[PDB]
Design a protein around this ligand. Structure first.
Ligand SMILES: [Cu+]
Ligand SMILES: [Zn+2]
Length: 154
């Protein structure tokens, strides 16, 4: 079973344009991700699910949060540490969205972290500025807590 999640760019103003969806397709090895996005910085980008579904910013002390109405990366009970190479953390954490040198991603990959669209039908996807393996600096993901795009599942 499958759902085509339309992701828009986000950058402290809130929802921008789109440049790609990602198709989510559930299987017995979980959520198969197949991206089709252009116009990103042509590296590698962390992939999360977030606690609410809302690609919208917050404003406080004369300054804007990138996009955060979606909540944290689905972080109910833990310590603050992120799910990764050792220990334990949040269940909304997923393998890194590789992009080719020309700024386009297509990699058919899978997250066994969840195994039906019914597990995400109230949430957002989020394409994160860094890849996603660290908790071990005074800010998590090595500072990669920022994001280029978001998409509410519908
Ligand atoms: Cu995130
Ligand atoms: Zn996390």
């Amino acid at each position: 079973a499958s759902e085509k999640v339309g992701m828009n760019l986000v950058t402290a103003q809130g929802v921008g344009q789109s440049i790609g969806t990602v198709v989510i397709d559930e299987t017995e090895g979980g959520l198969k991700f197949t991206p089709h996005l252009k116009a990103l910085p042509p590296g590698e980008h962390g992939f999360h699910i977030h606690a609410n579904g809302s690609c919208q910013p917050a404003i406080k002390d004369g300054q804007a949060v990138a996009a955060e109405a979606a909540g944290g990366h689905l972080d109910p009970q833990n310590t603050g540490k992120h799910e990764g190479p050792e220990g334990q953390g949040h269940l909304g954490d997923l393998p890194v969205l590789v992009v080719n040198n020309d700024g386009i991603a297509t990699e058919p990959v899978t997250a066994p972290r969840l195994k039906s669209l019914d597990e995400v039908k109230d949430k957002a996807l989020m394409i994160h500025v860094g890849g996603d393996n660290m908790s071990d600096q005074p800010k998590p993901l090595g500072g990669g807590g920022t994001r280029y795009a978001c998409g509410v599942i519908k």
